[PDB]
Write a protein that binds this ligand. Structure first.
Ligand SMILES: O=c1cc[nH]c(=O)[nH]1
Ligand SMILES: O=c1cc[nH]c(=O)[nH]1
Ligand SMILES: [Mg+2]
Ligand SMILES: [Mg+2]
Lengths: 289, 289
């Protein structure tokens, strides 16, 4: 299963400059650097993805680690064996830029049988803080499994279907881990952290506590268990380009109780490190380690 | 002219935790730290905003500089006199999170007569690469001066009107600078860098070169001179909250010729530093320096 691009113009170009990743087909040997990539792990925070790469290095059995995108502060990239770790910033536009350049990179490198997993934090709906949610379906603010984007003057809608067997395999992996609360459920992706997630603590708020609670309860009823900001564009682009995608997010709070993240530093760090424990278990099982 | 929030729930909270800025009303004395802020300058790149703060420090007459948000890799913040320099990442969601927390911060600090200027890069339409565009009107992909966002289950539309006299004053400032190509024109804000700006070099492309050229020419006809990814949410939030906003972007290429940014390193650095020259001139004139 090869990673493929869906653009007939790429083939016509003499060189491909991955401007935001500060990489290129002329300046770099992409099949030699990335041809053996089988696992791509993406998160927002560059410090957290650096820590994930260092963690995976030890989990793969090996005994500081160079940013392949050291030339740019937009994104960071680390590679340990068949595992690629990439930061993507916050929001649908920031991850979309990364995904466009990454899908082109994996296709130039002729990668195949690639699993890509978004790891991060989210807000929970009716679930205990620190719960790990494996997304089965990524939905928009209207609880619809679709990704809408504007291309020129037109709105184009794409499917956000995530690989079902991969979400089942990640859940089966999670059961072996002690003190690891895990759940398979829908994930709602929004464009705004504050008004877009029904928060009452933003600079702007025109709705009531009752209106936000009714909204969150309807989301729970539609099967939504967590809220984040990258899942729909991630699921839509990866599925379409030959990548088996998954979303594994830890919850930092239950939105049916509050909007402000107020956790002790050591609890926040523990929760933040829960998705990487599952991915490590999953990669180690896939590689026979 | 005080910076104001538009949320009756903020007043009811005992403390306000600015989670992404790693600041708070309980942990910090916000009126003492930021009460004298009169100029806020925002850009995507943390390295570029660090360099801007160091540059402004010397331009204000003073003879390394501490990140006020050093505790988080999401955003960076530097202060030199009445000038606040903040990174905001890429895209409408990343800058929206920053703007929500920043408007709350400036309001807790009781700031007044605050000018906020987005400085950055963009793609040009029918203008020479390296041209500085001062936005008069920020428009969406449909060339409409509006900012649409999803709040709970509803779409809410806001005005993207930028301060006219401030754009005229920045243009008058730009005329004194030698070898500084400058223009006042509309700026189109998109959610996607590739398909969203009519690029033919993304991972996905379902349209033709002719369709993208027709689109860009219609944008030029509607008064659009540059394309970037943060202007509409920036103009919509700031205007509504008592901030006099402006957008000053340098163009890296003319989109009527190409999609890939291919510039010599020293030309890219020169172009990147053109918006900060104008802001320095503007702040120095405002302060009588
Ligand atoms: O509530 C939350 C917490 C983390 N990320 C989100 O998008 N929402
Ligand atoms: O073409 C460009 C260049 C910089 N930023 C953009 O949004 N578009
Ligand atoms: Mg880097
Ligand atoms: Mg910081």
């Amino acid at each position: 299963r090869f990673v493929h691009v869906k653009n007939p113009y790429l083939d016509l170009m003499d060189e491909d400059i991955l401007y935001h990743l500060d990489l290129g087909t002329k300046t770099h040997n992409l099949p030699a650097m990335f041809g053996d990539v089988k696992f791509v792990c993406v998160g927002g925070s560059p410090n957290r993805m650096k820590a994930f790469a260092l963690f995976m290095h030890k989990e793969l059995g090996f005994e500081d680690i160079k940013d392949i995108c050291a030339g740019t502060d937009r994104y960071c990239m680390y590679k340990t064996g068949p595992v690629l770790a990439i930061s993507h910033g916050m929001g649908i536009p920031s991850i979309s830029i990364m995904l466009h350049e990454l899908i082109k990179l994996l296709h130039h490198a002729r990668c195949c049988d690639v699993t890509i997993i978004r790891i991060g934090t989210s807000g929970g709906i009716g679930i205990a803080p620190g719960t790990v949610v494996i997304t089965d379906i990524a939905v928009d603010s209207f609880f619809k499994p679709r990704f809408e984007q504007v291309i020129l003057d037109n709105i184009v809608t794409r499917s956000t279907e995530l690989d079902k067997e991969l979400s089942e395999e990640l859940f089966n992996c999670s059961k072996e881990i002690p003190n690891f609360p895990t759940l398979v459920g829908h994930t709602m992706c929004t464009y705004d952290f504050y008004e877009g997630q029904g928060r009452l603590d933003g600079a702007l708020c025109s709705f009531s506590r009752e209106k936000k609670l009714d909204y969150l309860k309807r989301a729970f009823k539609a099967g939504v268990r967590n809220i984040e900001m990258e899942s729909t564009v991630f699921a839509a682009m990866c599925g379409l380009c030959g990548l088996k995608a998954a979303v594994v997010c830890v919850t930092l709070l239950d939105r049916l109780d509050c909007d402000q993240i107020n956790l002790p530093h050591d609890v926040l760090v523990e929760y933040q490190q829960r998705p990487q424990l599952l991915i490590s278990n999953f990669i180690r099982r896939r590689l026979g380690l």
